Every structure is written in structure tokens, then in C-alpha cells.
Amino acid sequence: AIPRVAVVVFILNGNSILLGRRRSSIGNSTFALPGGHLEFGESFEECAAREVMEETGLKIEKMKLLTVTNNVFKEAPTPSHYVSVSIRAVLVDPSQEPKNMEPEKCEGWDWYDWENLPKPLFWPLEKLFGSGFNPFTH
Template sequence: METVGEATPRVAVVIFVVKGNSVLLGKRRSSIGNSTFALPGGHLEFGESFEGCAAREVMEETGLEIEKMKLLTVTNNVFKEAPKPSHYVTVFMRATLVDPNQDPENMEPEKCEGWDWYDWLNLPTPLFWPLEKMVKSGFNPFSD
């Protein structure tokens, strides 16, 4: 097994915030996946539940309050390329808005260019590669 420096796997929780047939995506500003469209999400904190992490990250990034969270799937993503090799176990959740009329705000402009709703059958490109891989596999966040 090849190791990369002191890199250790981390856990990320990402959220399909759904409204009608659309999902909320933001354009990343990051050393990993810069200028790709991705779901809101972030690192699981010590002692935190998946649902707690999902609600916190969506609020921190978009200002939106979510509910009806459900675990959809888990993926194992290794980013070997520089500048920062990393390994993420990614927990994918689905949630809906507490207030469907609320619009997302860009709460972290240094990390994201902005948030918008995109029809699941007409997603923007390029997608962040873990999300692109799921879409190409036929994954559907709307089915149980």
C-alpha cells in the first residue's frame, strides 16, 4: 500500500439539498477541484452526527436551514495529484429546505463563487469529480 506523506483519511459530509427536480450546487474555489460545481458540505467534526454536520455545513456555506435529512451513500475518494494529496470517505446526504422560498447566500466567498439551483437532468459542467463519477454511474439522489 502506497502512502503519501502524513496524509490520513478524513470524513466529509456532502448534501444533496433538493427542491423539485433541482439540486443546489456551488462553484468551488479550492486547491482541489477549483472551478468545478459541487454540493455543499465539509469535514465531520469530532463527536458530530452526519445530520448535525450536514445542517451545520449547509448553514455555514449557504445560510439555508435544512430538514428531512437522509443518508444516501458513502464513497471512498483518493486525490493523489498535487498540490495536496488527500483521501476522503465521503458521506452523501439528502435534505430539503425548511423554507422552500429561501434563497441561498454565498456565506464563504473565499471558498465558493456562488450557489444556484440546477435541474438534475441538466447539470452544469465541469462537476467536481466525485460528483461527476456518481452522476455517470446513474446515481439518482431523488430515489430511495
């Protein structure tokens, strides 16, 4: 029961980002970014690339730090505290399309225009966007 580090990735593709619905004890069915737990020894950029590859099959590059958010999940099966480091990234091959590589954790990935985001967003993401955060400018 300590805070744990997650990296989440904004894959900027045109005016769109990649989101998919979680299959999870936490935030089930809400739209969230690809990402996951930072491994011991791993840089943010390597973790971003690796998690995105594991979850979506996509090859990304130009990983750049955006910000960090503190996410305490009060009403969870087990009390959870995650510190979320956000990374922006772009596709290596601009023609690539995601695949749902981990259907046990995600309903599927799709591109969503920044101006037409889906709902409900995973609540840390809703709160981050509600603050005015924009990965296309930040």
C-alpha cells in the first residue's frame, strides 16, 4: 500500500488520440489511454514504448514528457494510489493501426478527435482535461 508509478501515453495522430475502454476492477468501461506500470530500472520513454507495443501493437517514437498526476482511488476493491506520468508520442509508421493485443484488459482501441472525445473518460483523465490540459500544445 504505497503509491505506484504508471506511465500513460498520448499518441498524437493528426487531431486525434488513442483511447479504449478499460476492462478492470478500476474505471471499468471508461475510456483511457494506453499505458501501464513502470518497471524497475526503466525510463519513462522505454515504458511508454513497451506498454504501447504490448497493448496496441503500435510502434511509437518522439516520446516527450507532458506532466504527472496523483490519482488516489478511494472506492476500489483494494486501496490504490497511482502516480501517472504522461508522455506524448507519435507513430513511427504513419499508416499503422492498433490491434487489441490484451482483450482481457481493454475492449478495443480507437482514434478520437480531441474535439469529439468519447464519454465516460476514466476519471483521472476527465480531471486532467477539466484542468485545461491539452497534449497538442503543452
